[PDB]
Design a protein around this ligand. Structure first.
Ligand SMILES: CCOC(=O)Nc1cc(-c2ccc(C)c(NS(C)(=O)=O)c2)nn2c(C)nnc12
Length: 139
């Protein structure tokens, strides 16, 4: 009956959905983030792709997510971290581009963090319950 696939596919779907929501609801809502919503346009930044080796932006990350490219937390956080890392490399730490990439990276970390609080707590509750029941038939 392919339970095992269905369970994994199902986990994929919920994950992508979560990632898609952090991107559009979080990272794209940072004020002054417009420039991070799309790939850096050569016509307005002709040096960009001479200095930047692995470029990324929030729209390309949405596309990846829509195609289930990110199968772990770390794979996703690798592309997110490039947002800040490419801004420091191209602009340095003093720039508004760097201040804004920082806000964007920040809220993705805060959001994934608070999520995991919630999971690891639900999980501990599940284990209490499981202990409790086993403790009751013994009595
Ligand atoms: C100060 C000297 O440094 C830089 O030029 N910095 C950067 C400049 C721009 C940038 C400019 C102009 C426009 C119109 C856009 N929008 S688009 C259509 O290219 O997506 C983006 N992005 N950017 C990003 C990301 N990271 N750094 C920069």
């Amino acid at each position: 009956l392919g339970t095992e696939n269905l369970y994994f596919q199902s986990m994929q779907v919920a994950f992508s959905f979560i990632l898609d929501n952090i991107v559009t609801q979080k990272m794209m809502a940072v004020p002054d983030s417009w420039p991070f919503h799309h790939p850096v346009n050569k016509k307005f930044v002709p040096d960009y792709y001479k200095m930047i080796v692995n470029p990324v932006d929030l729209e390309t990350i949405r596309k990846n997510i829509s195609k289930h490219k990110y199968q772990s937390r770390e794979s996703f956080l690798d592309d997110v971290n490039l947002i800040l890392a490419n801004s420091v490399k191209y602009n340095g730490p003093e720039s508004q581009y760097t201040k804004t990439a920082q806000e964007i990276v920040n809220i993705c970390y805060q959001t994934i963090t608070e999520y995991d609080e919630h999971l690891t707590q639900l999980e501990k509750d599940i284990c209490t319950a499981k202990e409790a029941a086993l403790e009751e038939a013994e009595l």
